[PDB]
Amino acid sequence: LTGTGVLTESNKKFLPFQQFGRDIDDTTDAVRDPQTLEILDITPCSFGGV
Amino acid sequence: YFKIYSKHTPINLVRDLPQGFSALEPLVDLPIGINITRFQTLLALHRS
Ligand SMILES: *[C@@H]1O[C@H](CO)[C@@H](O)[C@H](O)[C@H]1NC(C)=O
């Protein structure tokens, strides 16, 4: 799974089967990292109009 | 892939199924790759 974003701590209580997370608009918002099993929130990198 | 979804619910109804909502969490994702068309459940006898 490839993508770009900032990985931050999260407070989402994932169930054991659950691996990643999707927001209202269906964009992936969090992922569970292998090896360490932690849940990292994915927030899109800042962009805007110059 | 043979998917087993499971849920355990504490109930106190005597005879029929309870009426309510309970989502089944996925329990086992099983890699078998075989044809299944018929099944049979296993019970336990009591000997005295
Ligand atoms: C390796 O990954 C497994 C699950 O993918 C995990 O249970 C285990 O702790 C990991 N081991 C190390 C040394 O990261």
- Which positions in chain B touch A17 (Cβ < 8 Å)? 25-26
CA nearest to A5, candidates A37, A41, A48: A41
Q: In terms of CA atoms, which chain B residue is nearest residue A17?
A: B26
How far does A15 lie from chain B, in Å, by closest CA? 9
> Residue A19: CA atoms inside 13 Å, Cβ hemisphere, count?
5
A&B contacts, CB < 8 Å: 3
The pairing of strands A6-9 and A28-32 is unpaired
Q: Which long-range contacts (CB under 8 A, 24 or more apart) does A20-29 make?
A: A28/A1, A28/A3
* A3 vs A22: CA distance, rounded Å: 14
The structure was resolved experimentally with cryo-EM
Please name the helix (run of DSSP H) or strand (run of DSSP E) that holds residue A42, with its range, or none: strand A39-43
